[PDB]
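Q: I'm building a small set of examples for a reading group on sequence design. Run inverse folding on the following structure and report the sequence directly after it, with nothing in between.
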């Protein structure tokens, strides 16, 4: 489990994919994940939510025609998801949020 801001940041830029401890929300649902119950570690031990498309509707991350933004959960181990997220574009710009996507700062 590569679930740290630096670990995942460095894995992405090198491997151009998330480490394997990540699964998308639809994949997690398909295994019995119920957001309201905080049970992800029960149905998907060692996994974290990551890989879905992040809309960027509010223009907070730098836009470009042909740049797609995705997200991944950081620092998660069990229970309810936290407020930590890595944001990564198709051309590997790496941003982080610690507050539920309200604010972003560059990490890579």
């Amino acid at each position: 489990v590569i679930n740290t801001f630096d670990g995942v940041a460095d894995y992405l830029q090198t491997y151009h994919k998330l480490p394997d401890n990540y699964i998308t929300k639809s994949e997690a649902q398909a295994l019995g994940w119920v957001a309201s119950k905080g049970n992800l570690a029960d149905v998907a031990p060692g996994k974290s939510i990551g890989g879905d498309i992040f809309s960027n509707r509010e223009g907070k991350l730098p836009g470009k025609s042909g740049r797609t933004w995705r997200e991944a959960d950081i620092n998660y181990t069990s229970g309810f998801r936290n407020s930590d997220r890595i944001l990564y574009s198709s051309d590997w710009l790496i941003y982080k949020t610690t507050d539920h996507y309200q604010t972003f700062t560059k990490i890579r």
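The longest strand covers residues 48-53.
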